[PDB]
Amino acid sequence: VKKFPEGFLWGVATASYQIEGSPLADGAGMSIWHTFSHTPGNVKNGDTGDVACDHYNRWKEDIEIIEKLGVKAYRFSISWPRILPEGTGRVNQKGLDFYNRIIDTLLEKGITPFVTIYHWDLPFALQLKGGWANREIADWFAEYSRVLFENFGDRVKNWITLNEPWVVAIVGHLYGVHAPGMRDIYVAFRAVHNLLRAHARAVKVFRETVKDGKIGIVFNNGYFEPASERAVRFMHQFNNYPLFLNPIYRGDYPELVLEFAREYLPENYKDDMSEIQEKIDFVGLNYYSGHLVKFDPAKVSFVERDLPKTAMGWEIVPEGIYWILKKVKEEYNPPEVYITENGAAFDDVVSEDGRVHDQNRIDYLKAHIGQAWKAIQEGVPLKGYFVWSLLDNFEWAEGYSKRFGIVYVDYSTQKRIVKDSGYWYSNVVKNNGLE
């Protein structure tokens, strides 16, 4: 058996654009993901978030599912354009009403809300002004964050500024695969820098408005290994939490990042570093996959390995989640850590018996929860673990073709079908560990 600490937070996680649909309902502004997905060629099969899981209408049922499964924490995000349709200035009361109802319902049912302030749906109106490329986004983000704190901070006490800022900057502005779909390395590193400045401004406002809350930040991470017996050191520093935590904790970007990217950073970027060091309460780590890597004349290539893979083609390496937990304590020793996302996509099907027998997902989850347990036994201050995702949903540029849910969604009807993995995870939470 592997029992977790008393009060350990077992959660599930979603994001606004991925599940809600109704992106323009009730006076919401357009987001960059609305315009991106409505641009031909950007998203698989031309999928958009127009409907998604229709959570904008079915939110109560979904929460009742969380309650029914006995899950103790719900990580969800707020759509900035629902709250400020032009990004700054005017507040949309109906946007506030939507999240107020979700928040009150969670607390009613004894579920702890973990709110992601930014999970990629920037207001289109701000993108017209440069979005993450514009230094002024630190002010815009501050103003947005303030509205949320003032309206919800009385009940929500666990906050996350940014989800996966590396993805936002690099995948959104260098690779062009995510909104806003740009391919400019100088823009992308300006976005890295501004993401930090905006995160830090929001934390500052938080200290002034929610004196009894906790606030953190979420990073994507991969477990990188060398093909033979440094490129691994680069990938860790660039793609993992150090890109952001070295500034936050140490006041500069990591060494190998500066070697690669100093030319792409703003000229006096160091002048922002003391403000960026604003104290945070916890670090969220997302983890999905491992990668074998080797030098290649970013001077790094991935080497495909055997290993079981998910429908994403992501290699399943459970010891990565232990490694990254250990590594984060070793390098920056944050007071609290959460695994804010962990999960897998598989080609689920509803059997004739009306069940989704996703043993593959159960095995994936079980293996990773075990490794996180291990990190805990060896001193890592892990306070929680969130499965991505409660529901199958819009998987960004993959559209609906990738199902991550522990609850199956039949998009033709919007029917929810709890998967075997969901029943399994429910037992894990009730028992507060593996058995």
UniProtKB/Swiss-Prot annotation:
Matching PANTHER family: GLYCOSYL HYDROLASE, LP05116P
Signal peptide (UniProt feature, chain positions): none
Transmembrane intervals: none
EC category: hydrolase
Pathway the protein takes part in: Glycan metabolism; cellulose degradation
Protein name: Beta-glucosidase A
EC identifiers of the protein: 3.2.1.21
Organism listed in the record: Thermotoga maritima (strain ATCC 43589 / DSM 3109 / JCM 10099 / NBRC 100826 / MSB8)
Keyword Ion transport assigned: no
